[PDB]
Amino acid sequence: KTVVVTTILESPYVMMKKNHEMLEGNERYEGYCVDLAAEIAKHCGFKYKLTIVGDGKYGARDADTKIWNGMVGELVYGKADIAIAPLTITLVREEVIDFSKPFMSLGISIMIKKGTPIESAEDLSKQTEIAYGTLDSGSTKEFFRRSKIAVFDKMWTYMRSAEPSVFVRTSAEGVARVRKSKGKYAYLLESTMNEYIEQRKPCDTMKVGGNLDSKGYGIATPKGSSLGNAVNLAVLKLNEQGLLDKLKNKWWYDKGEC
């Protein structure tokens, strides 16, 4: 009756502890989602096993094979009982798995190298010297592609045809590109990651402007799983009790290096 939890190595959600090689089982891991898993399991009265998603992906459907990858695939295909991770609640995912109400909110945001003369999306859109882009797939890119807002439409037209490519293959790549580009690249990404990186050495990036959209991370379970009802109530309780806000502070701010 041990619950198999799928999650992903993404800081500060799930990280290998300092001495992890000398440790076993759930004790190898630390982070926001590790803490959150422990609290959900306590509330629902279950034992569980943390497992890192085999392919290191969140969950997208291949247009050709129709196969779901990532944590969503592990749920869809019966390999895990619950995903506890920074997994964005999207329409296509909601169609195939069940989600709790969100445990954390986020929106698209702008990361700059400190000293970059940019304070908003409008600022980016009106100029050319400072390049800017998104992950080469997912929620952030799709936001721009689809936007009917003039500023964002202008930004998309620019990003889609910019040379060399302004797209990056991973979050770490986007962050590195801001850091290496001497103020000549701004990266559009989730607020949560932006805010986390801002609190980390070498303390050379900053989040600017308001968020461009709004979405949430949810706990996911296989469609119709009986675990879903209980974990959803657990999320609502933990939020109301102030525990979710505490955990955010714990992992983003309390020991911020900046």
Cα gap 192→118, rounded to integer Å: 20
Per-residue x/- mask for ligand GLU, residues 140 to 169, rule CB under 6 A?
A: x-----------------------------
Cα gap 5→236, rounded to integer Å: 19
Selection from a second copy, ligand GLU, none that 99 binds (CB < 5 to 8 A by kind) is a second copy
Nearer to ligand GLU by Cβ, of 171 and 225: the residue is 171
- Give me the helices (H) in 127-226, please: 139-146, 150-161, 171-180, 191-198
The answer to whether 243 and 135 have CB atoms below 8 angstroms apart is no
Is 24 labelled a binding residue? no
**Rounded least distance, CB 243 to ligand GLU, Å:** 21
Amino acid at 99: F
Is 240 labelled a binding residue? no
Q: Which of 247, 204, 215, 250 is nearest to 94 (CA)?
A: 215
**Rounded least distance, CB 94 to a second copy, Å:** 6
Using CB under 8 A as the binding rule, whether residue 217 contacts a second copy is answered as: no
Q: Pick the binder of a second copy from 23, 180, 214, 258 (CB under 8 A).
A: 214
Phi then psi dihedrals of residue 164, to 5 deg = -65, 170
Size (the chain), residues: 258
Q: Pick the binder of ligand GLU from 5, 135, 197, 234 (CB under 6 A).
A: 135
Amino acid at 134: T
Per-residue x/- mask for a second copy, residues 28 to 67, rule CB under 8 A?
A: ----------------------------------------
Per-residue x/- mask for a second copy, residues 79 to 98, rule CB under 8 A?
A: ----------xxx--xx---
Query: Nearest-5° angle of CA 38, CA 43, CA 45?
Result: 90
Q: Which of residues 67-106 bind ligand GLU (CB under 6 A)?
A: 86-88
- Burial track 25-60 (b if 16+ CB lie within 10 A, e otherwise): ebebbbbbbbbbbebbbebbebebebebbeeeebbb
Contacts with ligand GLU, residue ranges (CB under 6 A): 58, 86-88, 135, 138-140, 189-190
Known binding-site residues for L-glutamate equal 86, 88, 93, 139-140, 190
Contacts with a second copy, residue ranges (CB under 8 A): 89-91, 94-95, 99, 101-102, 105, 142-143, 146-149, 213-216, 218, 232-233, 236-237, 239-242, 244-245
